[PDB]
Amino acid sequence: ESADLRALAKHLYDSYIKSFPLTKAKARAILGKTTDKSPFVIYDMNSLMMGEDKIKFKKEVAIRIFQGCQFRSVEAVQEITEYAKSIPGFVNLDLNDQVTLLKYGVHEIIYTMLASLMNKDGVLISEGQGFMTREFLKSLRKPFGDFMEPKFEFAVKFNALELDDSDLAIFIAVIILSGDRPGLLNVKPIEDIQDNLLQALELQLKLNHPESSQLFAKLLQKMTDLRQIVTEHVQLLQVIKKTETPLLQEIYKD
């Protein structure tokens, strides 16, 4: 029934709003033009120095930035974890499976949601208070110059679909309820749920983007691009391990 799919769609949009403080609509207004404020721009080493001193950020510079992405990605995991629980049926799943789906899904959500904060020239930083340019990130080092580049390329491609928060809220849920995560114990109810969410997403895009033909298919094929980016992210973290050689190390276990 199309009413229940629409009900599922709004539920999720309502949860998403409560879970994620900095929304795409907001990020876009900031990027985009709503000149009621302005983010501090970081475009080289000197602008970074002021960036710290001016707005509060709670060794080598290339390292210090990388460690900031870690801090922020840990914050995002809690936000995504909170959102997951609102997805109808998710908390009724076996607890090991809940943890499994969060464990593997979280990086895909992060880069998906990152794209909302990125344009072709840079990324909003620190609750949108800043803007780190793409050039500045390119110019970091032999290891750290390629950390963000693949994520900018995906964003450019992802953002060309012009999804909004109402669309994304349902896409994110689809991602979490992936029944192919390794080590899952009861795959059926996960797929039962994802199938329900895929119906709601399908209907969401049709009503919200009636002229955008086959957008559902294009977005689902963007799931390969997310998976490939996540794959080649740990491929950098393996090399970081052999370059960046205590109780904080524990907090950012992964």
Torsion of CA 116, 226, 154, 201, to 10 degrees: -50
31 sits near ligand L92 (criterion: CB under 6 A):
no
Residue of the chain from 70, 139, 186, 243 that contacts ligand L92 (CB under 6 A): 70
Residue of the chain from 143, 225, 233, 244 that contacts a copy of itself (CB under 8 A): 225
Q: State the binding partner of 195 from ligand L92, a copy of itself, none, CB within 5 to 8 A by kind.
A: a copy of itself
Question: Which of 24-32, 110-118, 125-133, 208-216 is the region at the interface with a copy of itself (rule: CB under 8 A)?
Answer: 208-216
247 sits near ligand L92 (criterion: CB under 6 A):
no
Residue of the chain from 64, 85, 157, 206 that contacts a copy of itself (CB under 8 A): 157
- Angle 42-251-183 (CA atoms, 0-180°, nearest 5)? 110
Interface characters, 147-166, with ligand L92 (x: CB under 6 A): xx------------------
Residue of the chain from 14, 135, 195, 254 that contacts a copy of itself (CB under 8 A): 195
Report long-range pairs for 126-130 (Cβ below 8 Å, ≥24 apart): 126/55, 126/57, 127/21, 127/22, 128/22, 128/26, 128/27, 128/30, 128/39, 129/39, 129/40, 129/55, 130/39, 130/40, 130/41, 130/42, 130/51, 130/55
Supply the DSSP symbol for 115.
Answer: G
128 sits near ligand L92 (criterion: CB under 6 A):
no
How far, CA to CA in Å, does 180 sit from each of 4, 86, 121, 149, 174? 26, 21, 35, 28, 12
Question: Which of 52-60, 109-117, 118-126, 226-234 is the region at the interface with a copy of itself (rule: CB under 8 A)?
Answer: 226-234
CA distance 247 to 9: 41
End-to-end, the C-alpha distance of the chain in Å comes to: 41
Contacts (CB under 8 A) with a copy of itself, residues 168-187: 178, 180
CA distance 164 to 1: 24
Residue ranges in contact with a copy of itself by CB under 8 A: 157, 178, 180, 195, 198-199, 202, 213-214, 216-217, 220-221, 223-225, 227-228, 231
Residue ranges in contact with ligand L92 by CB under 6 A: 65-66, 68-70, 72-73, 107, 110, 114, 123, 125-126, 132, 137, 147-148, 233, 248
